[model samples]
Target: PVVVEAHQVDTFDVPGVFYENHPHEPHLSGMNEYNQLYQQSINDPDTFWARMARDLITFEKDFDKTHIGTLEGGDNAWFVGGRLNASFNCVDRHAMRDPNKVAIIYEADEPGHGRSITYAELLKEVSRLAWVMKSQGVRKGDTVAIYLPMIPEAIFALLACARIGAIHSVVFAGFSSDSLRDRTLDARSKFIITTDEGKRGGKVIGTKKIVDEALKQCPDVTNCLVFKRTGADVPWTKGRDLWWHEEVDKYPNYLPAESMDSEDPLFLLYTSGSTGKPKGVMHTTAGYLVGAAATGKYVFDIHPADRFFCGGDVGWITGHTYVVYAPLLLGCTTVVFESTPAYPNFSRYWDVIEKHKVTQFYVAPTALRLLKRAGDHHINHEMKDLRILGSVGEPIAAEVWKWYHEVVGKRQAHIVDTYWQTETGSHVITPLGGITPTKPGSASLPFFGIDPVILDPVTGAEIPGNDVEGILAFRKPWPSMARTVWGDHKRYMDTYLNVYKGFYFTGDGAGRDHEGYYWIRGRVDDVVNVSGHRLSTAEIEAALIEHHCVAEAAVVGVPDPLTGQAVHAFVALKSGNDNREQLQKELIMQVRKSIGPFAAPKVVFVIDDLPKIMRRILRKILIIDTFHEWKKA
Candidate 1:
């Protein structure tokens, strides 16, 4: 694949230098804190995590135990016996301290059309929405499905569900009706909140209409809250569907935020599954919220007045960690941008940053490649206020990382290439804003409580030493780790926990450089992260093979600028049929129906022969080759 060359590296001792450069004084005494943490990571991981847990989390009932289980049992619990609430931690605490502090900064699709929400405003909105749900008989632990766009209302919907202790299952707005139906049915949801219309990438999406279509098969759904996004009139059920304005008026502006247990279900986040089904990745209340908040504070170095911009959709884990929870928990202004990087033009991102004076900018490498390809002229903004830059979803190529630093960030902000997943609530192996030394392609260091171990893939045994390349595994469970799969704990165990036993198995392979920095090599499974969304190649292939004209099929992930991974299939047709174009269309439709619209292949091919002529082909090889070509392109 892509070759990495380290010729002029000036990364060592950057963290201490960064600390010295900080204008605001932290409680840390010299490099004592950093050294102690580094020492503790290798000597005693449990104690290190426990100390951070006590310092970072606000627990009603403190946990006495740190961990239980081996890498083989698939049962690993961190901060057991603890009690806390997610909404309270993210909202109530900030509202009580400083109600006037900005919680979210809304950056609309068009320039000069953004708004900021204070903690007080956020609290009121959440309370009102929770009241709306309560009036409709939404009980605690009841699953509420949210299908919304990247708007302030999405946060309100999530907080409302958390405020009343209702478990929310948020399906991405880009998904089709069929996908929505599968999630709603899987969660046995009774309530669904959506917008009448959503505008993104200069296109109008009838979100509420899709929910209505999905609800046709979801009989258990009793209530539908429709927010008027574009003021578009669409088909509506009189009794079942209620307008957002009407529902909010029926309830008071203030309501008590619920207090949930440590293990109480918070939300069910679905990721792609290998068995042609989506896995509902679930995270608990106390631990997950704690992890999210801790990472926000320490990793992102979120200051009270700093404006944080994370360009990830609220539908994904990156959004949950950075967009919704992080900024709110830190009581800072989080910029929620509602458009893609290359929306109307390639300069959209830089334009947004200049207008908002965004202090900390976070996004995926996919956007980086696109903006980089657009040339440095598109990135004309100085963004003098930017102090921290971050990357997520996939590996940050050295060239793209340098371009992000030099062109976009103006070499002022520290780049933090965070590495985590939907299951890992927040960053596991990542750097604190200006507190950790960085390598070009490396996910610098662990947050407060992380012990990364390298294990040989074949042996399934831990490999000792600071410098080694192998399958990366976690030595201890963290607070933000996913609790289970919704209605399928067995699947959760088999996917993440059961594979490695007590240790948390990160499906992605990685390497530690001589200086002990983590360099991630993407996933090694059927589930591929396509344009940031985890998808299945076999499922796509199966759909293609199902077409009447197709004989044999193979699907692979190729890299693209817009989407992190693009689906490219190699197909061999039947002897008599030769209508490839028509068959391609049918195959695309089958995927759209079977999985979702987002999973549909951006490009499909009808080839005469398979490469290498092997009896079987692996997606891993395809991915490696694709990544290499993308780097060259």
Candidate 2:
């Protein structure tokens, strides 16, 4: 039994004007309506989710069962016996309805270098690429590696894989050759799609060269398709490398979409692992599409004509759901941004939004923090079309939130602080943009079909009351929950399901307010999110240890203004080492070479000795001891 103390907290009501201008009626009429629907969703989830599935997606074969199995069973399935095609749902269906409606609003790396691809154009591109992939020996269920930047081709590549029932494993273009190689080998990918070069923030990335290096270790990879993005001269193998334009031109503009079972994998996104490797978080077709569509409709208030700009890379979960699937499935124009927020100026994002008349804008708090700190002079654009402002990745400070609402949105757009993870696949706890009232820091309420529970962290038991603080867990499974860690279902069960017994553990701490609103605290695990990129401290340390000069290494996450959390490394070198400054630079490069520039530690401290007990040390204790020692010195 748990007793909870109540504390009064402030709440803001949903603006009535938003409802007046909303393209669709809000999901809930009011909080009373929300309560009624939420109770039914919990008490009768099968019927609740069954309706959601039918409403959101078009299935060739409709599901008879909404869900099967429990959290304890570690075999939860949603929309069982359903058949659908992700590419058809995301592209062909939209094209069939309105072929000329813009599906992708591709904002290129340089300002004014953007283009729009209509639904008809997207369908043609996807179908052509799917035929090309099939001709190149990519069969159904084959894994294709995508190592491209945020361009229209990236979207085509993903949809092409889906069109042929091939699984896509997209590696973030910023990752190093070694990181790419590891994932390629892990997924056993035979086909790789990349660009000749990638340009971002005035820097040209050797995408083809990196893929070439990665494929050196990936013997199984038989084909490499290179899209001529920059038309730069890049080295290529005659037999293995094929030009994207040449190959795709050989195929017809139409290919039939592959029929996929509801549980068939859509894509594999690698996230940082607790052990020295990264785990490929896998999401299935129907359930994932449903979650993405439902969240876009309810949380972002997505409408068919709305131009949605989600400033997240397609390499991450945020991008997978929002930038590609959600907006496309909802038949809305989605922006594919290839530039940084401060590329030309701090006003880049605002300028694009205003220019494109973007209706819904989604981004991480790290970006908000950077823009807020850069002074408000650049946010002078009249983005009157913007209706919903979303903050993701990490918790937004109240001051920053206000800046976003006031300066960016001009107090007109509603701010929805979405709380979810790669494992969850979509927004689990988020406010419906035009419906749910919000608290400053709270995620507000559970989305439909999510039954969140706060548990005592130490005892792994449910903390049953309002105004209680504990670890956050879900009492029941939801549609969007990640099916498994690709090739490692047992590890997935152990990491998420087995720990909490009857619930799906989120690995995050949370607090339930007196009014039953949820506030997300950062991760309780070793994973650190830098600029919304999840990285493992252990994995970074492993990269550091790979260096010949390093004897021992410890990595920790520290507060960063630009990135929510930045990695800092403490290193102990092998004996007979001089020139600490030179070695520090080398150590940073080592991590970049092994993983990617994103995982590289911004600061490295050289320590002659690291506290250890029998060759092992607790990271928390080590961080505390090192901090105290540094202060004393």
Candidate 3:
């Protein structure tokens, strides 16, 4: 066990406890009912999840077992012996029920350029594309790497691959050509899907051009289907490249979806790890669908005909689960947002919400932090239909949470500050939109079958009882947890399973409150020690965020001669850019008062903006140019 000096803390040290302010009837009646179901889920996990699987998905054949595996062995598989099609589950039943129902609301990069696809139309689109892939030599179990912008065609391509039993690996369009090339070759994809051009934040990216460069060394990739996103002139390979619009139309609009085994791979999503090279996290067919559907039904309180808007790119997990899988699996209208939040001014998100009357809106805290900094005037629309506001990708500071709840959501929408990673598959810890009472910074409670435990870092022993802090771990494997890191089962086993022996250790740190609520303390690496009184960097950043002028902040620990480790913070203000040494002092005083004086930043560099990770982009980045100077001091 690795030794870590965890802090000794109490509830008073926790962020402000904000109780649930929702007035609607949630999926569950209240706290007591959720308690019973949660207890039942953990007690009889197989039975509980079995019913959920049958309840949500339309399976072609029944599964022999709900789940079979062990954390010790790292041999977990869900819905064993089952047969289903992900595309059928996501689109078929909905199309048969209501042909004219709006399935995908395509919100283009420009507000004026948008369209909607009905479930009937989606079926045709998906079927034709599946035929296109099938005719192009894509077979069952083969991989198809998709490198495209945030457009409806992207979803069509995803569903098409699933429909034909082709495992899809979607590389985020923002990735460099080399990154895309690395993922494509790693997945052994023989077929690739892309677009001519990508438009975002009022800028254009030569998507096909990037693909052309990446395809140089990818000999296995024989065919490339290019979608006409901008109808721009692009270099084409006569024998290798094909036009999506022309090719898809050449095939019949009706093709049967291929049946897939329960444990069959559904998609490969590469996780951009903080400390190492990326790993393609793979999720299975039936189990992943069940997790997405269950979360969509309860977590979002999604009803029929409801419109869902997720401000994320499908290149990441949030977009995979929330933006695509969850909403579509629930038969709700999912928004294919092809624009940035700042594209047509800061009002773009608000405009979409108003225009579509989105019932649920999920966004990363980084974007929320961005919009919060952009001022509240950007939020002027009356989103009467919006009921659930979601926060993902980071440990949202209490101040940002308050602003999201009071300002953007107007106190009408319930904020489910969800906490889950690409590995976990779904919301492992979160407040049920209409059900659970929420805490400002805490994710509140564990979802069904998520038995959260706090591990003593120094001893690697389980830390029992509330009002404690340590590394976060789960005692059981839920349906949605990724099966393995694609092409690297050993790495998956080594990374998640072998980290702490029996427990499925989440690389994150957390605290359990007196109410059994969980406050995610960012990543374990983000923990800081100052003279033996350890502090979570997330907590210190939250304290800095409590200051009125501060918009966003990133705090890191550095070597100090006196205190052992000093808190060095990089901060960005809402507007002012002048000398504010007094303002920095005010910010430090806020931290000094909120936390102990020892937790105050030794140096605060008021910067313009912070760097963001490719996927999570969780409102963190250090200005390394000045950090070396702090060491010199």
Candidate 4:
């Protein structure tokens, strides 16, 4: 009999033993080797960083200094005297090596409608776009805004900006006109790039229409480069709008790469807060490129010919790093998926992976949760080509994680639940793809050059030793740390640096095991306070997911008269149970038995699907389902 044990609050059951990477014959061998390298990483930061910086990236000019300043002062910088171009590092080098190499696998919204872009073709396309920007009077140090769907042209636009030493600020394709206008104006951008239309889940979005509406608010936006995705006669500005195909043909397929200063801003990624204008998080050239390459190589075990597929949109940081820069920097084939997982059926992702022969697959937990709800029949594949399966954005519940490992992975793939933020630049805490062992729900451990610590939530002092839970932070700054929040260094200092004396506050809570392993317990704000007992919403949510009938769960901290904060949980059932009253009581007891009686939700709401709500709504889709369901009941 297969005995099931309740998940404890502190202790971890290491089920990652069998999921250990056996591909490429195991990247680092074992734990002794990892421990030695991790020890060396902290003991000799300067040496390790310099070696990694040099090995991963070819500097235009060798850096004079490896490190400078301090995190306490919020004036930290890396590769101080170096100069480089992100375009050359990402596209030029790879193109020069193998012009015939396929750089991008364009998986369109429709399954049978896609094509591949070669490195030579990418060079030409990038060069032509670069010339278009330069011809239209886009100058160095200026930020160019990009608003496009998941197409090869999006990557071309980004590289084109880098080619001219212009910063590329990409707004997500699904953003409203107001959000687009705000981000563009905030970045002081004069130029914009977008598609005429975008197709996702068999639906058409008027992308150019949104850009035009956004440009209505701008007094200074000079040009909007529009790609004719579906044409459809979009509203265009006479001198302000230029067709991508028409303009690219006016120039040659070559452009000289600009030599940007090491600290020159590479791109601006806007991250919105609970209130106020969205802050544009800025990343610089050399250090950012180096961090992307190193993390991609080590964390994902990226090889030269490997096909990497990350189902994150290019507008977000995950797509910025993994979907565009990282794989290209390492000279690997990256799949640009311009579709949804539910389109054509729930088997879209699995089919795409098999068709592309994707070696490494990365996606957020929400998609996994969606597919899990759609059932296991959608996941009928050998999946022998896959080596690494990554989870990002939020904490994946243990039950769903097991489904990922056993059902989708078939006990062959290593699941790396990567933990990082838009501000962190790359994977901060993650398991090395073909090296480190993992524990199901935990992110496992920190990446190279990352020194993690647990700080007491109340005291704000470092908590020493294992089996302790508190706020998570890093003790040192790395190469790829976001330089500033664009025009607001004070806000950057206040939010990250000034919060703690010397450490970089991650704004998330975590727990360290007896052996110093980490279990991310979600954000500290998500921790519910019920009659003085602190409880993690993710912990309770994970507990609810353990019940056999539940498919997805969302737990929030709702204010109560007596308890102060009560666990208000809403769940979507896997199957229709005639006795909802019985199953609801079972779920409450499930959490009580799994964690404790204090963490249990008094009432559980059952639904067909989650509409991405509460503080944890990370997905882009907008369907008012959850709140509507709750209100009716």
Candidate 5:
């Protein structure tokens, strides 16, 4: 139903100009360096990536080869045999070089009230937090739960864990207490860092209260580090809870960085899973750091002193790569924006960019649509310095893409439609700013070592050439690629690697355009991304079918404005069901009870029959059918 249209524009040399103007040692400095790198990237990816690896990162144990992965088997490994620490690369190096340089620009929920932290100040905060962890008897390999807002402290919490070699598990601030508890308990975490409260999009979330509910059932929790956001008075245990500022004050300003292996576990992030319990997608140290840095460098054209802003919650993979790892690793000033584009008004995003003079703005398309509908008034602020605009998450409609370019970016910046997942770790199919040209709605091309292959779902054979559509699989392993599903490698193999024999299956449908551009066609699995959160239809249906009056149920995703997809359920009631109304009500309640509050169906239809054929089924019927209209007496 969505038709994609492209508007051709003349290429600019600003990306090269940025390289020339950057303050970093490895100056890309204009079109010469840009052309050389671009040629090398396509002609010889291995040598190109190896050079990047050597130049960008300091390895403890130097890797002999650059990468070893094929298009047949999805095992693309970058920075092979290289060793480095993520925390050290991002924090210690920046501090050592110029401790006074601004590393983070914290834009608070309220305008003009936030603080900026220099690398020196960040080092002090991270060191103190590390000391706090050590004081609580936390050690390397132990997992710490972080339930905080977009505040700068979140970065501190992550760095502190990395500094001490502890794995951090960050739950989105918007998730319910039960979700938080499940993730914490699954990891068997003993320590958690959270705030008493959080202010975002002009609303206060009771972060500490939720943590309290989650910790009540978690008997293993030994200590809780609370940041006093909004200065809200919160319930706390006497010895169990400690204030972040008070504890940090006791520790010294500096701490020695630890030596870590190249393959060390960095962090565990729970992505959307079709499986009932979400899988903690694990990313290791060296490969992840390399991937993040490489992508940030080549894809986003990140330069030292350039202001970069990516509007993804730190709870998800987008935040993990762009917000936390990428820009910081490059020593660029990354914007830690705490407000939504629609908050206070629709002009919030543009206002932040104009106020901060942000160069690159990255976000999902859904937000762009919302802002576009908010009318021209929302795009009032002039973002003069903007050079690169990006798109992430699901497939962006072509109309929306043009609007984003013309309306938001003012036809100045290049729009990079990035296509990758939580499992991939970095952008696989994306246009490097001003290097690779792009289609309006396509993720332009593969990054350095990314070999995107199309496979026929029916025959299970690799389909070659452009103008092909099928399941997407990487032919080789990648460095920043997820190592395994946390605590369940077997399940990981079954879900990703083992599904198609040797390949790492992405479970996403894709189409390679004639120009060899990859267009993501959303998920092929039962899990759907609503708003930005992942939800499984199978899990929700299982909850709904548990009701006594329900005989069978099927759930499907339909398009929505705020959430990219809305859940619609098709139900068949029990024979001669006299109490249909009460049972339908009960069915909705059951979903809430089983899957928490967010998984409940937005619409439920009591159908006479679901058209079931011998070979296949019809699921798209509900798109046209209004489920809420049907009622019974």
Candidate 6:
């Protein structure tokens, strides 16, 4: 018989100085308070969320009912019968309070190449752009595609869309033309927003050229609004192209915000699917804003006077929520970083934090891995204002987490490991920066309204008590839960709601220790996190199969010290092809051209047969078990 010993694990308490300058106190006072409020939220969510919504957001017309939906039907809606404008809450309210306050700190690709935009200035820019969009034949409920790099104009484009009740779909700036074309066609966007050139890490990208190539397949795109970031002369379409500066000069500085329903579509962000294509995750207005503001206040401890910096691109969910929506909703200064981490050196992030007096800094673990290897000397900066340091994207290792707490934070700032998804819209399982006690690897506790459940993977039954490991799920729906995949309600139901009845399956494995803390073990599905970017095995395989010399290809993710996961491909060539070494380079380039450079495989293995015990793809498991065989070859 096997015997297990019961031992208590140590917990780190909040430091005293955290609450000294904190404008908003912790939502939960202590463990007892957490238990009490958590019980109330689970039992009567209507009352709990109603109070939270009122505290976080300002509504034009208040809501009557809190929520009405079920886990079985997957038609959850929050703030029913309510009306509000997203742009009004995010910009107009802040601008009215303090016109001269800095709203955005634009940090360009090179160090010290940046500018500041005040709240008043931001409102004028956004309003003028909104008027320009309206004049270009964009109407309410119309979708517009944005393909621009990190800049202040990105935020303006997003807010301008909300100001006119237009849905915006922003693709990653690094994506190839083919990827952009697929997303543009799927969203059915009529207008495209791009820059003449994008300068990132001292490299100029022909953004207009990429948009032009993508628009070849999208004949329905009637207008392309281009901004002149650089004075590079580029190709132009005669009647469809227009200059952004010229059009904005013709519009007024004040455009009234559109009155939108509570459940109006705000934006659609495409996330990778296990199948060949990506799924466009859609989020609504009121509930999504409430969730973003609520989490920004509690998890990051955002204040009016504080400066928040989230090093994520607008193309992803982290950028959509934290980089833009959260800080802006809280009425604080947000940093728009347009450079790589290793652009100047390892000290780039520390320099920015110290220069701007950044109070809250959020980033992914892959960048931390790179910076940690650079040396501790690079992090030598007097970032006394930085009280909260957050890590996201994937499960952080214990060693990296310790380095962040001790070296980067200098034993002062609180380290918060936020666990969420594009579907959750905000931080679901994370620690309140200074309030909650933290363990090294645990995502300490649930957010205000989140109720996490651990279920047996095999039986689809709830596993009771601590020290249980299984698939993660939630029994109830939260406010910011994604409404559906674009144009596919059945796929949404089958993927999340219908997986196990009465439970919203998260498709990730997790474990709860004896202390009732959750530890996220990565994805249980085919999707893999490569340097914080999500990629699907099926998508890579499909790209590899498109090669003329390839017959069958299998893609799998393996452990990597730098990037959390590295994609590795196995290919079997056709009958006529015999040069395996030359074909490997072509297959790698094929994935790069198909998706983006981030999705390229690290290593390609030409194998006689892909070893498998079952019918399913066992390449990932085999690589984990006997990786030495592939290395020795």
lDDT of each: 0.79, 0.88, 0.82, 0.82, 0.79, 0.87
User: Per-residue CA lDDT of candidate 1, range 522-569, in tens?
Assistant: 776656787677887777777677777778877777667667778876
Among all windows of 10 consecutive residues in model 4, the one with the lowest summed lDDT is 1-10
Residues 457-542, model 5: lDDT tens digits: 87779988867888988766667788778888778778888778767789898887666667788788787887666788877777
**Cα RMSD of predicted structure 2:** 2.4
User: For model 2, where is the 10-residue window of minimal lDDT?
Assistant: 613-622
The predicted structure with the larger TM-score, 1 or 5, is 1
> Against the hidden true structure, what lDDT does model 2 obtain?
0.88
lDDT of 2 by residue, 1-633 (tens): 121222444677766667676666666677787777778889998988898889889999998799998899988899999999999999998999999999999999898889999999999999999998999899989889999999999999999999999999999999999999999999999999999999988899999999989888999999999999999899979999999999888999999999999999988999886664889899899999999999998889898999999999988888889999999998999999999999988899998999999999998888888888899998888877888999998877678878987888777889999999988889999988877888777798998889999999989888887878889999999998999988988999999999889999998988887778887887887788898888999899899999898888888887777887788787888884778888889999999999988889987778766663222243343354665576345
Q: What is the lDDT of residue 9 in candidate 5?
A: 24
Runs of candidate 6 with Cα error greater than 4 angstroms are 1-9, 21-28, 611-631
> Model 3: residues >4 Å from true position, as ranges?
1-25, 525-633
- Candidate 3: global Cα-lDDT? 0.82
Global CA lDDT computed for model 4: 0.82
- Give residue 466's error in model 3 in angstroms: 0.4
User: For model 6, what is the alpha-carbon lDDT of residue 146?
Assistant: 96
lDDT of 1: 0.79
In order of listing, the candidates' clash counts read 8, 0, 0, 0, 12, 0
State the lDDT at 97 in candidate 6.
98
The TM-score of candidate 3 is 0.82
Task: Give candidate 5 regions above 4 Å deviation.
Answer: 1-46, 64-81, 543-553, 571-600, 606-618, 623-633
Q: Distance from true position, residue 453, model 3, in Å?
A: 0.6
User: lDDT of candidate 6 vs native?
Assistant: 0.87
Give Cα distance to truth, residue 426, candidate 4, Å: 0.2
TM-score of 4: 0.82
